[PDB]
Scaffold this active site. Structure first.
Site, mmCIF file in Angstrom:
data_model
loop_
_atom_site.group_PDB
_atom_site.id
_atom_site.type_symbol
_atom_site.label_atom_id
_atom_site.label_comp_id
_atom_site.label_asym_id
_atom_site.label_seq_id
_atom_site.Cartn_x
_atom_site.Cartn_y
_atom_site.Cartn_z
ATOM 1 N N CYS B 162 0.846 -1.184 0.000
ATOM 2 C CA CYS B 162 0.000 0.000 0.000
ATOM 3 C C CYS B 162 0.886 1.239 0.000
ATOM 4 O O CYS B 162 0.819 2.030 -0.931
ATOM 5 C CB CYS B 162 -0.978 0.022 1.180
ATOM 6 S SG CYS B 162 -0.251 -0.412 2.793
ATOM 7 N N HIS B 189 0.217 4.927 10.344
ATOM 8 C CA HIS B 189 -0.548 3.807 9.834
ATOM 9 C C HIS B 189 -1.511 3.314 10.911
ATOM 10 O O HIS B 189 -1.136 3.154 12.070
ATOM 11 C CB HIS B 189 0.407 2.715 9.342
ATOM 12 C CG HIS B 189 -0.220 1.724 8.422
ATOM 13 N ND1 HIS B 189 -1.381 1.045 8.721
ATOM 14 C CD2 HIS B 189 0.171 1.287 7.216
ATOM 15 C CE1 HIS B 189 -1.687 0.236 7.715
ATOM 16 N NE2 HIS B 189 -0.759 0.377 6.782
#
Ligand code: NAD
Ligand code: NAD
Ligand code: NAD
Ligand code: NAD
Lengths: 341, 341, 341, 341
Positions: B162, B189
């Site tokens: 990602c 994150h």
């Protein structure tokens, strides 16, 4: 010299060793061995740095005498040399060589009389299963209630669960004074280490769900266990547990039907007196509007919130907090201490 | 026509299957197999109920044929029959019988060339490792940048991470326009599934810590992956990642040294124009005061927050959100659909 | 001795009083008054029970004496008798009669030179604004950097912010040794008292959003404040802040361009030296793999994580933790102690 | 058309206007004005972006027509033009000119018969207090229980609280069938807007504590409110609410003593039948292992979890979820739709 070992250096296992050092009164026994499926460095790190209970107030140094690994732990005017093992199969553990008198089984994977006996095969004289009984045990023990019912012949013992260690005293006290026709319990418990961070495959579909973002109702071992300890309460109590996104501390919400007149005053007076006379070691009461995190690092099996007591006719609710981790770890040490005379 | 399988029905694998139905445009391939070590009942439950992206809007029926298990899924006017398997060893998977054109490896455990080839041995024609490469890949692809550089001969492909999918476009766009001497990345994150509910043994001592109660610095696979995609940037970009207790959605903070005059206005203008032309597929730009939750369920690979762009002297910082699950999932589909012509 | 007052008995105000009792070395000044817009009972409860830092280890009793409310606090072999006020308007406080030498202004609300003067025009000889300056101030002081520059004419002083106390040393230490062309700061901060629990109306549309469920980028007072302590850093440093859902503790990423050759080793060696010599009272350095909750209740103004130090070319990044409540409170007390002559 | 107006564009007010657009059947009145003490740009921002319920699936356009601010909203093939106000004092609102038939009073500030009448003396014909009544009311309604019992002469109506509307149907159904002697309620409830991000002064010492890190026992208006709807239950029911750190969705745990024989099967079969007949609009039953986050955005007043029903002797527990925002906003619309002729 009573010699204890911890199988499983986890949330409980670690907090047993810490509680040995933190206790105001030095314990008349020594932890000499720990076994986990993890490297000594991971264990030492987790022992020193704890998200829930803070840094360890002390020093730990590793030595490799022989081909054996030792932890040298210095805290609170106390020292211990602790052997570290890494043996997944508990029958291969050197409990004969180390002269182990008691094993604290804190892995959660060896709760059957069969699995526990594997420690006896390995040389340990006695085993405390730090969880509820699966099949059979010689005794089921709630410290401060029935720990004097331990026989010398008894080899496999359960310290049940923390929920059990909180529920039983409450039930014993209330049932003795007023009579419990029947009772139902709701436990509001913090996250446990067996849950999932995100939604993930799991043997239990409810506990597979994201721990930090969900209210998750689930089963409790505390009732099976309470029936072992108190047989007359069979078919008079059930309940369940709820996981919520806090890190530590739980509460019990006990609703019961009374067999004689009750008021909020008489319930709270009874619990205060019980906490002062017969249960002072393990039971406290508070009159303050507190919340879970105020009971973090409390050593009591239960602390009753007197402001929560409710009565409507014959029906009543009482409410108690406990530190699921520290409360239980102290009771493990209290129990071990009780075997000596 | 082209037949895709998914190995690992987790946050990626499950959102791949969902993204296929939800896509506003029907993909030209079909997903016809899924494998996980868990049972079909657990898989259907988790596919239907999700803490992050809600109830699946569709019907899921399980067919147990004599030997085979299938899912019949109906959503958004599309239907798939999907064989379900439970094989831990990818080489024993029936990829030959099922005529698997592409396998999406979404387990996290088969990132080597060796481990990916095990799918090839099982009969699959192509693997896409859903992760940064570990050693060798025939190509390392960021959809919307170098997805054309996939050769028809290429059998093991990496779709990187990602983070990489987002970092690479930023580096490419800025480097082309202003030139990057060097850059440094901070990623913020949400929690991932490999983390720990409570403090627990784990091979990273930082990720062993309670996910829901800590800021956790940690390494990123995105830097090594970027150097495979953009080899000229070796020795010119480093970075790290921080886990915080949200359930989903990440941000990337990129700090770079420009090799020619920069202003905030110029940087933002360039980013806007690329999201409107060359990167309209994978990239968006907002000037609104938004927060992580607002990007939950966005398919874009990155969304630049232009209000956060800063410049002092030759140094600048930009910032971009992405849905770490949904964006990635969408880009796997987008890749698989690029192979056809 | 010197007589100190606290205006605003909140996260900072309460922890100031707590840290006076908990300090290893007794401060040579007394805290003799507190003022809040809340009832003494609310203030005592919050003082005694804290979600972040635990129970107060000591006793608090309330007394009424001539219409005056006093708190008698005993802890760590120390006692304070502390008058309690409830005046929303600083000009109407009894600082003259109480003979207050220093007011700690901890409300958030009186940061302007003119508002802070309301404490002077009520009898106090000096006011420390516990926040960055709004408009102007006589001095802006970071303890450990420039507390010695305080003059007797400095009647309104800014102790700046948590973030500034951490940044200024870092920027100073590194500018002096290697030279800083420019720098950009990213702060990761735990939730603050001014955020919203659920999405709610707010002055900032980002801090309007749910505190427990979002990554929230936002402005930082630190850079304006840093430029007022180090005017040469005007135009040479900017940055911002990110709120994440943890209760306490923060981190700072400083990304700078050096003006001389750098390596990870030389940077860490310089910061270790500074933590050993000149900045030993306010700065620490860790090499262990720790997380946010490991710095809860640390008194340091910053603890550098040397494992996080990165370098690429002339561009580097350093990472430091601080307890944003306990550090700042200890620096307030430390500042007041610096006044004695 | 009947013309509705909203005082207080918060969690309820905002979800009311969303619920208008999202509802599968079109409602036969229009929302023609909203009031709040915050500016229009904030109101639109919080209406379009929600941390709980996601992005509004529509378009909002602010227009200025003659010193009158209007919102032009389109979603789900529907349109509205809504005047926006910013009036702190209800008596100054222009309800007479706008021809308001009902005001949804969703501020939490104007719950008295006196404070609600300010909207009558300002021109509106009817008011609904979107909370438990403070003093007295012409009617206290639970849509789907006693909404037929509204008289046209009634001007000050209460739609009670979320909790009241899950509790009342449960109590009615069970008492009617089996007879309830007494009952106690535990509510497990996500954080609400009135709580504290950190430990902060607050009217309620429990709700003063950090919302994101604590289990918080607190009062519940639901028991007052239920006794206004069902006076016979005075002195026969009591309970309380527990706040835990999820963002939305609550659960009710109801323990009662039945006046006749009961089994788990019989209780569950009663509630299923009801959810299919007289309570189909507001009640549902599930037997799937779901968690809180699965009931987010459910329109129902309660979803009974079958698996949780417990009976011991004459005492029994039941459990039901509800989305404390969406369920309630929908019942407010359902209330207004019932009034017509
Ligand atoms: N945490 C609580 O609040 C609590 C309270 C009461 C009882 N218990 C019970 O205590 C038990 C352990 O719980 P926990 O919270 O410590 O779990 P945990 O996961 O934190 O600890 C388990 C430990 O066992 C170790 N382990 C795994 N396999 C092993 C093996 N083969 N040999 C040795 N060690 C092994 C793991 O590495 C880990 O360190 C469970 O039965 C649980 O029900 C927990
Ligand atoms: N989640 C993200 O944001 C993200 C983004 C990009 C890449 N990735 C990567 O994608 C991969 C998947 O991780 P995830 O986030 O889905 O976590 P996850 O744990 O949900 O995914 C792992 C899944 O694989 C299954 N599994 C385990 N062993 C298996 C086996 N032998 N065969 C088949 N299935 C097996 C597990 O049961 C589980 O469903 C990882 O490599 C991860 O790093 C994740
Ligand atoms: N918490 C941190 O990490 C941190 C660090 C550095 C600086 N600060 C600064 O400290 C200040 C206080 O912040 P906090 O975190 O303590 O917030 P807080 O809300 O906990 O403290 C504010 C206190 O002031 C009281 N108050 C409000 N109006 C008042 C008035 N007119 N008179 C007297 N008391 C009044 C409130 O009742 C409350 O007790 C802010 O300027 C903040 O930026 C905070
Ligand atoms: N949230 C729930 O779960 C729930 C369920 C049922 C009932 N309620 C009740 O509904 C009411 C509203 O609560 P909420 O959750 O929407 O909270 P909220 O604080 O989000 O909403 C209050 C709104 O009113 C505005 N406001 C404040 N003063 C005003 C004034 N004088 N005039 C106009 N607007 C003003 C505020 O800016 C805000 O937009 C409360 O009584 C609450 O208990 C809430």
């Amino acid at each position: 010299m009573q010699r204890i070992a911890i199988n499983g250096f986890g949330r409980i296992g670690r907090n047993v060793l810490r509680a040995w050092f933190e206790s105001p009164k030095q314990f008349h026994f020594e932890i000499v061995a720990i076994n986990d499926i993890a490297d000594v460095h991971t264990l030492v790190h987790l022992f020193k740095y704890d998200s829930t209970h803070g840094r360890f107030n002390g020093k730990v140094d590793i030595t490799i005498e022989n081909e054996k690994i030792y932890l040298n732990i210095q805290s609170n005017q106390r020292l211990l040399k602790v052997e570290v093992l890494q043996q997944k199969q508990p029958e291969l553990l050197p409990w004969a060589s180390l002269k182990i008198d008691v094993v604290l089984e804190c892995t959660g994977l060896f709760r059957s009389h069969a699995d526990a006996t594997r420690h006896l095969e390995a040389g340990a004289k006695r085993v405390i299963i730090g969880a509820a009984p699966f099949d059979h045990v010689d005794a089921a023990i709630v410290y401060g209630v029935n720990h004097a019912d331990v026989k010398a012949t008894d080899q496999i013992i359960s310290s049940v669960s923390c929920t059990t260690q909180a529920l039983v005293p409450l039930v014993k006290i209330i049932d003795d004074a007023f009579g419990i026709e029947t009772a139902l319990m709701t436990e509001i418990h913090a996250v446990t280490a067996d849950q999932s961070v995100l939604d993930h495959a799991h043997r239990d579909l409810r506990r597979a769900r994201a721990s930090g973002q969900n209210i998750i109702p689930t089963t409790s071992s505390a009732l099976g266990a309470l029936k072992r300890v108190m047989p007359k309460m069979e078919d008079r109590i059930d309940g369940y547990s709820i996981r919520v996104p806090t890190i530590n501390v739980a509460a019990i919400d006990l609703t019961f039907i009374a067999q004689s007149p009750i008021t909020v005053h008489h319930i709270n007076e009874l619990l205060i007196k019980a906490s002062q006379t017969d249960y002072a070691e393990i039971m406290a009461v508070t009159d303050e509007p507190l919340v879970s995190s105020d009971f973090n690092h409390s050593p009591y099996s239960l602390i009753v919130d007197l402001t929560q007591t409710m009565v409507v006719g014959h029906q009543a609710k009482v409410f108690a907090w406990y530190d699921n981790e520290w409360g239980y770890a102290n009771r493990l040490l209290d129990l071990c201490d009780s075997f000596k005379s």
